Write a protein that binds this DNA or RNA. Structure first.
Length: 54
RNA sequence: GAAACUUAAAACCGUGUUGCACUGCAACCCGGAAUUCUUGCACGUCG
């Protein structure tokens, strides 16, 4: 609910976010998922690793 | 003895370069030190 007041300070005349985020307890209201005709997964995920190489 | 100017007239003048030769010159770095650097997701929102 902290994320909804700041999103309604720049938007809000299109879609009311304050009343909708306390009915299904989600913020934001969508999920950026994609498709390559095979598997539906997200947009922008990565797998991270590191090593201390000289 | 008392009485009658060794006087009159006459330029110390005429001619003549304080002139001739001579570098205010020779040698000398406006030079030595100094990062156009510090912070910043081409991103958020979907009847």
């Amino acid at each position: 609910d902290d994320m909804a007041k700041v999103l309604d300070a720049q938007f809000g005349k299109v879609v009311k976010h304050v009343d909708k985020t306390r009915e299904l307890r989600v913020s934001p209201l969508v999920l950026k998922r994609t498709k390559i005709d095979n598997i539906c997964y997200e947009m922008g995920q990565c797998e991270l690793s590191i090593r201390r190489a000289e």
